Write a protein of this length. Structure first.
Length: 314
């Protein structure tokens, strides 16, 4: 039904050469980043020096859900010595400037990796992530750092009626975006856009009583709304919303809240845990032209968010 263990294109070429890069490459030219394709038979990626600052980077080009990472090492075509990475960290970003290190509760997630130069090792993310750029960061290795790789996940838009409605793309125009208050005076509504914006929406006073501030999106016409993607903001400051309500409307005057079935009250959605890495919240489809997101709890810096609405036309 909703399959998200799909290989993203390292093995197949679905991820093109121009989307693969690295911190450095081995000085003899025989281990280019583009050799990091899973099951590739000509070595793999290997950096110039072996250190835990070195990394292999993949640009997915589009926001993608990431569920799993598969790695091998490599047997040198030249020496036939086997090289492999024994453990790594993961780093992700929507834009390639702003990075998050994957965590496991309190601290960094250390993925156990290969133990030979031939076998594939699969690590599932305990909690899946929405991202565009992926960085593998070896911490330990045998003989040297060598990688062949695959990434697994899916597009959010593969789910039925789950299109990005135009906050990111722009097809939802500046005039269609509004807010309770804005710190900027005569702000650019464009600032509230998921991913495509560098900053974000900040209300006037970073603190307020919960459910007093809102971002509102006019969809242009009545659509079917089936979810949101919420993201934090980079101001000076890095902020994100941790809890929010969602209200919706046809005529733009009479509002309704998405209700939690358990509590018979407006549902409290979980927000982000980072200023860049966004989160998808799906719900049962509603008819709406207007959607309001109401921050309820937030980071200590204040309310800061970027947003996208998910759905399709009637």
């Amino acid at each position: 039904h909703m399959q998200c263990n799909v290989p993203l294109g390292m093995e197949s070429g679905r991820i093109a050469n121009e989307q693969i890069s690295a911190s450095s490459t081995y000085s003899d030219g025989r281990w280019t980043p583009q050799q990091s394709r899973l099951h590739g038979d000509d070595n793999g990626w290997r950096p110039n020096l072996d250190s835990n600052k070195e990394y292999l980077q993949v640009d997915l080009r589009f926001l993608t859900m990431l569920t799993a990472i598969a790695t091998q090492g490599a047997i040198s075509r030249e020496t036939q010595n086997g090289y492999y990475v024994k453990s790594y960290k993961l780093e992700v970003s929507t834009n390639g400037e702003d990075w998050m290190v994957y965590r496991h509760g309190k601290n960094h997630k250390v993925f156990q990796a290969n133990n030979d130069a031939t076998e594939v090792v699969l690590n599932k993310l305990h909690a899946p992530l929405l991202t565009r750029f992926v960085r593998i960061r070896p911490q330990t290795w045998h003989s040297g750092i060598a990688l062949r790789l695959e990434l697994f996940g899916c597009r959010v838009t593969d789910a039925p009626c789950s299109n990005m409605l135009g906050m990111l793309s722009g097809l939802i125009a500046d005039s269609q975006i509004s807010a309770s208050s804005t710190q900027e005076y005569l702000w650019s509504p464009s600032a509230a856009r998921l991913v495509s914006s560098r900053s974000g929406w900040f209300p006037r006073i970073p603190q307020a009583q919960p459910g007093e501030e809102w971002l509102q999106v006019d969809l242009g016409t009545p659509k079917t709304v089936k979810g949101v993607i919420i993201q934090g903001a980079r101001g000076e400051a890095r902020a994100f919303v941790r809890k929010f309500k969602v209200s919706y409307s046809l005529n733009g005057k009479d509002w309704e809240y998405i209700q939690d079935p358990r509590t018979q009250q407006p549902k409290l959605f979980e927000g982000n845990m980072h200023y860049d890495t966004p989160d998808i919240r799906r719900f049962d489809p509603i008819p709406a032209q207007y959607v309001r997101v109401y921050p309820e709890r937030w980071s200590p810096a204040g309310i800061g968010m970027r947003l996208e609405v998910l759905g399709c036309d009637w």
